[PDB]
Amino acid sequence: MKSMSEYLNLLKEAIQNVVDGGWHETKRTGIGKTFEDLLEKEEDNLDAPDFHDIEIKTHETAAKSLLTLFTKSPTNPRGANTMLRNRYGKKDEYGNNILHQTVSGNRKTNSNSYNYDFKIDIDWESQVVRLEVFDKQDIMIDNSVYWSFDSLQNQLDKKLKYIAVISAESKIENEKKYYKYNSANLFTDLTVQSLCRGIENGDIKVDIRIGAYHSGKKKGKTHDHGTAFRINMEKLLEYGEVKVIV
Ligand SMILES: [Cl-]
Ligand SMILES: [Cl-]
């Protein structure tokens, strides 16, 4: 009756074998990198495809880490990032407008470096995530800029990777160092609904970083690698689908 992802079956097996393998010798970041080494050895033992691009951190290191889930420019309007920088941004060294601001869904921003404040609001009925813009007199002057839920879903589908948050014991025996892994929390999915709840809760941030080229034929024009959707790595265990392997 039961079915599951073939790849996930192998990855879980590999992680289960590392955890159940007791003390592992290492030449030591040490806890995570040793885990990465052992996982690499499981590819051969399982004749599995590569378990590459899985980020490995301890709970301790995860708590200090900020993960970018993906980058993505607004769905609407066309040329939104150019409007935002020119209208609401500030002049840089070179006389070109830029907008660099972290925005959340629980509070408005309050930066003294810009003449506008920002908040994310989830328009659940229209299935869009809106950027609200306020002037310093608390007037909400614009909520036209948005990301569709489908666009965000597509980013998640294309860009999400597995992550394992782990812990271990260590010891020294006969001048040699060993780690023994307690467990692994394997993050496997994040839904658009959970993403949007996380923005509302103040746990997921939207990092707008819209620059301008200073020279060349593109001088003065928008330089933007995409608005980044970011979350503390421990915090991701609140929102994601997570398998505990012990
Ligand atoms: Cl070993
Ligand atoms: Cl066990």
Q: Which ligand is nearest to the CA of 27?
A: 1
Q: Which ligand is nearest to the CA of 22?
A: 1
For the chain, the three-class secondary structure string (H helix, E strand, C coil) is CCCCCHHHHHHHHHHHHHHCCCCEEECCCHHHHHHHHHHHHHHHHHCCCCCCCCEEEEHHHHHCCEEEEEECCCCECCCHHHHHHHHHCEECCCCCEEEEEEECCCCCCCCCCCCEEEEEEEECCCCEEEEEEEECCCCEEEEEEEEEHHHHHHHHHHHCCCEEEEEEEEEEECCEEEEEEEEEEEEEECCHHHHHHHHHHCCEEEEEEEEECCCCCCCCCEEECCCEEEEECCCHHHHCEEEEEC
Pairing mode, strands 90-91 and 97-103: antiparallel
Cα of 46 from ligand 2 centre, angstroms: 20
Instruction: Give 161's Cβ-side CA count (13 Å radius).
Output: 13
Distance of CA 89 to the CA centre of its chain: 25
**143, 131 in Cβ contact below 8 A?**
yes
What is the C-alpha to C-alpha distance for residues 202 and 208, in angstroms, rounded to an integer? 16
**Tokens standing for 138?**
């608390």
**75, 148 in Cβ contact below 8 A?**
yes
Cα of 2 from ligand 1 centre, angstroms: 33
Find out whether 123 is annotated in a ligand binding site.
no
**What superfamily does domain 1-63+160-188+233-246 belong to in CATH?**
MvaI/BcnI restriction endonuclease, catalytic domain (3.40.210.20)
Find out whether 157 is annotated in a ligand binding site.
no
Cα of 180 from ligand 2 centre, angstroms: 12
Q: Which ligand is nearest to the CA of 20?
A: 2
Pairing mode, strands 66-71 and 228-232: antiparallel
Cα of 32 from ligand 2 centre, angstroms: 20
Cα of 9 from ligand 1 centre, angstroms: 22
Method for structure elucidation:
X-ray
Cα of 179 from ligand 2 centre, angstroms: 16
Find out whether 55 is annotated in a ligand binding site.
yes
Stated resolution in angstroms: 1.5
Find out whether 50 is annotated in a ligand binding site.
yes
Residues 6+ apart with CB under 8 A from 163: 54, 55, 56, 57, 67, 186, 187, 233, 236
> In DSSP terms, which residues pair with 192 in a beta bridge?
none
Cα of 16 from ligand 2 centre, angstroms: 9
Residues 6+ apart with CB under 8 A from 70: 155, 156, 158, 159, 160, 226, 228, 229
| Residue 85: closest CA among 209, 207, 205 | 209
Q: Which ligand is nearest to the CA of 16?
A: 2
Find out whether 234 is annotated in a ligand binding site.
no
Cα of 246 from ligand 2 centre, angstroms: 5
Phi, psi of 75 (to 5 degrees): -65, -40
Cα of 231 from ligand 2 centre, angstroms: 30
Domain boundaries, the chain: 1-63+160-188+233-246, 64-159+189-232
Class of domain 64-159+189-232: alpha beta
